[PDB]
UniProtKB/Swiss-Prot annotation:
Entry annotated with the keyword Translocase: no
Bilayer-crossing regions: none
Cofactor binding note from Swiss-Prot or TrEMBL: Binds 1 [4Fe-4S] cluster. Binds 1 [3Fe-4S] cluster.
4Fe-4S ferredoxin-type domain ranges (all copies): 1-29, 30-59
Binding residues for [3Fe-4S] cluster: C8, C16, C49
UniProt keyword annotation of Repeat present: yes
The protein, known as: Ferredoxin-1
Source organism (scientific name): Azotobacter vinelandii
Keywords: 3Fe-4S, 4Fe-4S, DNA-binding, Electron transport, Iron, Iron-sulfur, Metal-binding, Repeat, Transport
Region feature Disordered, mapped onto this chain: 83-106
Role description: Ferredoxins are iron-sulfur proteins that transfer electrons in a wide variety of metabolic reactions. This ferredoxin could play a role in regulating gene expression by interacting directly with DNA.
Skewed-composition ranges (Basic and acidic residues): 95-106
GO molecular function per UniProt: 3 iron, 4 sulfur cluster binding; 4 iron, 4 sulfur cluster binding; DNA binding; electron transfer activity; metal ion binding
Cofactor: [4Fe-4S] cluster; [3Fe-4S] cluster
């Protein structure tokens, strides 16, 4: 499985969803998650993220391990997103800011 981590929060560019061959991204207010059962590990989304927030689960940073689990449980509760959208208005001011998990919205 590929995993969306901290820097997607409050950016949510959604570039990643056009490349997914199996449409396994799910959408929250200010973040996206990958459903781990569905991902086929094609790695196509990882170069597409402006925020470089996607990682192979074996590559997730030591300080971001919580995201592996988070992606798995939020994917169960959020709706499927299959079309790109515009970025959050604010996206480019929040891109690169650390610790954005305290800003996550369910
Ligand atoms: S690795 Fe491939 S299948 Fe998995 S979320 Fe990315 S684009 Fe979709
Ligand atoms: S910022 Fe988030 S919505 Fe996709 S393009 Fe990057 S994982």
């Amino acid at each position: 499985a590929f995993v969306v981590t901290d820097n997607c929060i409050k950016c949510k560019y959604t570039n990643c969803v056009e490349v997914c061959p199996v449409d396994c991204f799910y959408e929250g207010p200010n973040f996206l998650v990958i459903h781990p059962d569905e991902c086929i590990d094609c790695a196509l989304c990882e170069p597409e993220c402006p925020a470089q927030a996607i990682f192979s689960e074996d590559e997730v940073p030591e300080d971001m391990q919580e995201f592996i689990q988070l992606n798995a449980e939020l994917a169960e509760v959020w709706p499927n997103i299959t079309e790109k959208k515009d970025p959050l208005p604010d996206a480019e001011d929040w891109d690169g800011v650390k610790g954005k998990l305290q800003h996550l919205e369910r």
